[PDB]
Amino acid sequence: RIIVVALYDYEAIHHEDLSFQKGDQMVVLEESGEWWKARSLATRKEGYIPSNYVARVDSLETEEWFFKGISRKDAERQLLAPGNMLGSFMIRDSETTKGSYSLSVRDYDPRQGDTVKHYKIRGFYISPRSTFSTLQELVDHYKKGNDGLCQKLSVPCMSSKPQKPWEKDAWEIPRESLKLEKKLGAGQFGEVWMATYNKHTKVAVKTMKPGSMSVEAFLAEANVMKTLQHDKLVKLHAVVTKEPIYIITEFMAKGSLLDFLKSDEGSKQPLPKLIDFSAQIAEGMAFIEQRNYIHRDLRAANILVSASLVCKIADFGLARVIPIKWTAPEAINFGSFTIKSDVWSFGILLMEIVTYGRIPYPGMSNPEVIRALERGYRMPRPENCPEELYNIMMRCWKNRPEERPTFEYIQSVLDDFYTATESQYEEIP
């Protein structure tokens, strides 16, 4: 017997899936990955449920202040989101001290403004002065005035329902299931439409126009990208095998990063949040790097922004199934695309972000640039760019692609850009 409990509200949208309120319990009957067959205890109905909407009874995940599988940087982003205030906190798996837990607390500071400070927890305790049998008790105490903390505990971090998992056994779907409602953009290779999958589900469809490339071999290449899932890559949901091929991805509410930075709201975005974007793209490129693959076309036009202002990477694994200002020299000439050729493109993308979407090398045509890259000309630093940030672009713009950084390093440098190493966690006597 395995009892689980709902963490959020879910209304059914399919045939054999269940509806449940927050707090409903149910018996796990089958573990089919993203979807589980369960029998509700409230309605006694047997059906399918999203496994990422429930957890085992009286687990820590059930608790409103606990956050599973979240990094220190995500915990920082989640707390500095709108809807939280002074004292807003969370308890999470310690990213560094594995098998243990850390506490992230929102705090204000005149020097910078809102910040997130992190304390490690070691029965548990932070300072030997105060011992605690369990976390909830430990929480309660620190809600009663800051016992050494930078602030007194107020409310757990605001969380929203995760994205509903895709329909089961629906990697290949008929076109009839779709209603392409609005053309978002078109190009030399096809159109990107925003659509709807059998009502209830809002998707975006990339219509791949008929060609030589992968007529019967697209599904093959495309089936690999499906296994390269990441929180910072655009999620591939479904595919239409009948030519013209349709690619169903998740809908990114605020379009491309390029169009977004050129937007009004985008122009309002300050500098530390632009670097936050960069650190997200770098996080995604660090994954493609770990899988020893390649994106082949990094630019703001290929970065999408969610409604929550989360940057994700598209298309990826598309240039291998079919423009040079973002391209490194050793690919313009020798046609050699490495993971380091993307590093160059990231440096360009970085500048593209700091300049709010300004075209690289402005008032400077393509041929008038290639002959400068041989001289050693690089784009200059603008007034609004940190010296230590232009420093990174230049490292991405090294002539030797071997002495260019890794995305693993680039991400780490961008994640704690305003944080000194020693200041990551707080000391307490």
Ligand X SMILES: Nc1ncnc2c1c(-c1ccc(NC(=O)c3ccccc3)cc1)cn2C1CCCC1
CB of 305: closest distance to ligand X in angstroms?
9
Which listed residue (270, 421, 427, 429) binds Ca ion by CB under 5 A? 427
User: How many CB atoms are located within 10 Å of the residue 198 CB?
Assistant: 14
C-alpha–C-alpha distance, residues 203 and 376, integer Å: 44
Distance in Å, CB of 317 to Ca ion, minimum: 42
User: 233 touches which of ligand X, Ca ion, none (CB within 5 to 8 A by kind)?
Assistant: none
Helix (H) or strand (E) holding 208: strand 201-208
Sequence-distant (6+) residues with CB within 8 A of 254 are 260, 263, 304, 305, 306, 307, 309
Residue 295 near ligand X by CB under 6 A? no
**Read out DSSP for 146-201?**
-SSSSS----BPP--PPPPPPPTT-SB--GGGB---EEEEE-SSEEEEEEEETTTE
Nearest CB to Ca ion, comparing residues 117 and 232: 117
Binding residue for ligand X, selected from 84, 88, 104, 249, defined by CB under 6 A? 249
- What's the number of CA atoms in the CB half-sphere (13 Å) around residue 247? 24
Q: Least distance from C-beta 260 to ligand X, angstroms?
A: 9
Q: Is 7 in the site for ligand X (CB under 6 A)?
A: no
If one asks whether residue 234 binds ligand X (CB under 6 A), the answer comes out as: yes
- Asked if 100 and 121 count as a contact pair (C-beta separation under 8 A), the reply is yes
Q: Which residues pair with 172 in a beta bridge?
A: 239
Question: Do residues 118 and 72 lie in contact, with contact meaning Cβ atoms separated by under 8 Å?
Answer: yes
Residue nearest to Ca ion (CB): 427
Round to whole Å and give the CA distance between 299 and 358: 12
The residue sitting closest to ligand X, measured at its beta carbon, is 185
Q: Does 256 bind ligand X (CB under 6 A)?
A: yes
| Residue 328 found at the interface with ligand X (CB under 6 A) | no
Region from 86-94, 247-255, 291-299, 387-395 binding ligand X, contact rule CB under 6 A:
247-255
Catalytic residues: 297
Q: Which is nearer to ligand X, 4 or 305 (CB)?
A: 305
Task: Find out whether 108 and 172 touch, Cβ atoms under 8 Å.
Answer: no
User: In the bound complex, what is the minimum distance in angstroms from residue 179's beta carbon to ligand X?
Assistant: 16
Residue (118 or 237) nearer to Ca ion, CB: 118
Residues of the shown chain interacting with ligand X in the complex, contacts defined by CB under 6 A: 184-185, 192, 204, 206, 225, 234, 247, 249, 251-252, 255-256, 304, 314-318
Residues in binding site for ATP: 184-192, 206
